[PDB]
Amino acid sequence: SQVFGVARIYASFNDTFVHVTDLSGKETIARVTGGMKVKADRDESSPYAAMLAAQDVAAKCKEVGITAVHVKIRATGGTRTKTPGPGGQAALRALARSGLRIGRIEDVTPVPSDSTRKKGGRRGRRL
Amino acid sequence: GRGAPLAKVVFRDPYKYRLREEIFIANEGVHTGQFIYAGKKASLNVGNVLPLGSVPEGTIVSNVEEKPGDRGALARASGNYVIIIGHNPDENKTRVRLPSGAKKVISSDARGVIGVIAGGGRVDKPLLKAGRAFHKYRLKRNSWPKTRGVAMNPVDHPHGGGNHQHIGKASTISRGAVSGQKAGLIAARRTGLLRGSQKT
Amino acid sequence: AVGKNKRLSKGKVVDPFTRKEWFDIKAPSTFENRNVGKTLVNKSTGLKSASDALKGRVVEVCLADLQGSEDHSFRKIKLRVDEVQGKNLLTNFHGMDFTTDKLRSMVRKWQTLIEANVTVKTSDDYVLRIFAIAFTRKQANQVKRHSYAQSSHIRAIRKVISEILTKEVQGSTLAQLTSKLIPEVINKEIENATKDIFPLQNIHVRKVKLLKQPKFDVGALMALH
Amino acid sequence: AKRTKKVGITGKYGVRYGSSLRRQVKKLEIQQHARYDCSFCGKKTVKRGAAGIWTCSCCKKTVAGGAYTVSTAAAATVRSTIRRLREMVEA
Amino acid sequence: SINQKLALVIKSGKYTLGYKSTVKSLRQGKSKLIIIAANTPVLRKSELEYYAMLSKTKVYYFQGGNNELGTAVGKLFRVGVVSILEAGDSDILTTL
Amino acid sequence: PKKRASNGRNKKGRGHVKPVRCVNCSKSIPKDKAIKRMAIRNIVEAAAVRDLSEASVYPEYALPKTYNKLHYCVSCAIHARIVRVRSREDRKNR
Amino acid sequence: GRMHSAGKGISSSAIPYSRNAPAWFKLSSESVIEQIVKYARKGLTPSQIGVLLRDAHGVTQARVITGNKIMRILKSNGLAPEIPEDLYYLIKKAVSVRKHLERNRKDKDAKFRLILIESRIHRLARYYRTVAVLPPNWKYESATASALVN
Amino acid sequence: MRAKWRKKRTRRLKRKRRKVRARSK
């Protein structure tokens, strides 16, 4: 009744990524991200770049013929941030409100069980 | 001439009533009186000659053969071993870890000796006096004592000559050079102290 | 940041969706509402074909679609394709995982967590590892606000579930175990086998991830489809 | 009588061949010359022949090992890993 | 454990130690249980088991060596084969 | 002079605890020394639930919730204004 | 207390006031002394003689029936061990720790807990030598400690 | 001015003077 895809949102610092994907996961559709929509290099993580990137992905999603996708918003993960980027929910709302049905929201960010060590030294980053 | 010891093991000739003498380099834990098993159906015990095509992952096997009917090609030194890091069922081959630290594939029908060769850690005590080095090198070949090419006459060595003790030209020698000037480092990728990892 | 590229290429247009075809996904009869969906794959050419790249493929779909009921929301099958049957492909149960969001809600402070694992082979030569979750309960009339176990009863229960999970797996093939973990009949019997040793609540299995598989045995696949 | 307090075995080398050098030599030789026991009889009389050769006088069953130790740590872990590998294989 | 039972039969009951004593006691068949160490040669265990089967006497192995057995029997020397002919206050014949 | 009865942070009868890393400045802070704040905010932003609902498969009923723990150093804690210097009378409040 | 620790856990016993107890015991003094010497010939140490006698028969402390404590009569009938019961208990424990040391050589705690038992068996031997129980020229030998346990 | 800097200067002084003594004795 309705074809299904994958959204695979990667929201992190300095960039946010939305990757339309097939259920297998190997197929790649609309690999645009929230970095090409702003010529300032500081607004990439802002909602403004996230909304514009989602519109471009939605237009590409309409061209191929995908009516719905499954979303799993993820962060950098590992031992870097472990928190979603500021542009995550902004991109999620923008792409969902362009005629694409969303379902089964999930968090797929990679979390370690205290693996390796984090950069910064014992006193950490001291700005 | 060989730091590792060789075990003299007798086999029974299956085609004619004679007893043969085979020389096998001794591994760890091999003792006189122990029954050794050689073949494709023997169990996984130290010293056996099981082929690489019927062994599990990660087995410590020495005396690895490059090709069938070679009778000893890899891991013939004291304290060395070859690790198994995968077999291919189809077009049967085996990726192995030779002591040098490189990747190579060989036929699964290559026989190997399970275990590590005796005499491990042989080079762990200095030679101290010149007598030990002389007695060690007198039974192998004639390459001792050696003379430095820098302190040599210019006619007898390219590195020699001059009122001082210096090489003069570049010590590194290209692989494209012909025999006659291959003195020093031949096709050296880089020189100096090996500060860092082996990048294996 | 389109105005930042300097060295675009070091060596010195038509999209590939026109060469893609809609392939419907099929699921075994263990789940009544198979109806997984469709995917994308390149055109079957002589160089690589489609069945070659489609033979190894894993698709994750939640049980709310395969089983239909809303109570199966927190479970998802990572279905793996293993055959092509003329624009329809057959799948087998390979990966099992429990929803990542519900883990963080499942784990709570002021209580002790359990952890058990095994390595057990089925009747049809499918070795598997089972991980089970379990949390202590704040029983009625209890006033102590920590619900902590002695941790020596822990050694008993993890032994119990390890022995029980091994026994339940013994005697059943891949078809039988797929029809029992969805109804969660096992979790009912963990409470039955652990009621008299420690009250317990929230019996769930995180992953039933598959490791090794037997020979192809294509005829078994048609039995499930 | 404790004739030499620290040089140990390396008293034949006199005052030559360094200090740290003579110390590694000392450690290697007191591993080398120690009296060992047969794993088949238990009598502490196993001696050393040539390199990698451990020959006893009572059990009369020479077992090849390391040049300075009957079975080095690497030999021990190798034996353990083949033990466990074959145990898994025949399990 | 096993060691305390052997100690008890040593102090209470009669005991025979070594090769000649145990083969003799097997020959007259006055023994009841024999103890053989694992470190001994296999031919030792095989012939001891054959003699025990001929004399229908039970056989018990121990997962240890010769010096271990000497320590276990409570004696400062070493023993390889231990045979008992009368328990007395112990009950090793009942169990094991 | 001494400021708190529990001197650093409730390190009593233990002697040592495994240090952890901060999530902002990556400072090596002890487990009990680092303040942990729950992050139970929903996967969707504030409000706007009906906007996804109109384009939601199934009759919604998803309501996913993200949970995370934040490890903060003392310097980052004051900078983030989550914990602020309290009066001497206030300081004995948990 | 807690000689080799820092605890203060109290677990002791409290005897009844009546030195002639419990006024219902009916077996004769000749009968009870038979039971102790019967258990003594089995080889049980006086510590185990007390618990079995107390928890099975109608006698809790043999002092109130017999003329002395259960150890004292053991001297009279000549069934006493060659060493005090205490010294045997730790020396068999000491050799057990030493047997542990021989196999694995990395447990620093086993070496440290080994120090505790040495701090005991010379102190008890010194008191025993002072009160003239052990021979006046008796010393403890690590190698001969295995021979002590018999 | 901090304590480890006092200690580092003093240790440097001991090393230089130890070199001086070794050169003399």
Added chain:
RNA sequence: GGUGAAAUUCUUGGAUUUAUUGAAGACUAACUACUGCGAAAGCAUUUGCCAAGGACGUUUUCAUUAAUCAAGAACGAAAGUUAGGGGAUCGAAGAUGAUCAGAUACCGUCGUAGUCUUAACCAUAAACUAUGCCGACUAGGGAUCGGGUGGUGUUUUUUUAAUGACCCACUCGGCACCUUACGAGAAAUCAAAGUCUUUGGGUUCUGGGGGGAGUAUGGUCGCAAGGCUGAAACUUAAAGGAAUU
């Protein structure tokens, strides 16, 4: 790829990423607590082997064998050393890019020793509860760990026999909290820092103004870096601790 903003650097050989794995090394996250063991350092996957330790209970034994420790012995964070294994992240040195009048620092990228392990040394710290150990007494309240006792207590099957989880009441050993001050303290505060001028339960160690200086020298352990003991000359009338505007 980054920062408040930049730059170095990698990208038609496809950087970044998606999907499948393989190899390597490190750690045991969420549960994880004014919560547990160990003398301390320290100890935060599964299972097996070995032994040891605290607490509980005893109408079991010994009998004062008991408290402290000169000299003397064992363990001892991280860093460092020797010989190997190992060598993925991070990363004293260094190479670098910014910023600054200057930056060989804070900010970014590589990167050696090191961070992991084996055998042997190094014997140090904000190694702090900045509070020595042993023994008795002293205002109260609740919660929490282990153990035990009793209450047809409530549950947990084949309601019921027992178990297991709890409830109630009590007790011992604990990590300890909350309110007060007869008491102490110069106060910050303390159920010990109280039972010290109404001065005495027993015992070990440390200091006599601040600098010089934990330095000189002499011994002593150590392959060395370094550790232990440890001054004097000379100089100053102020340094130091607690609260207040």
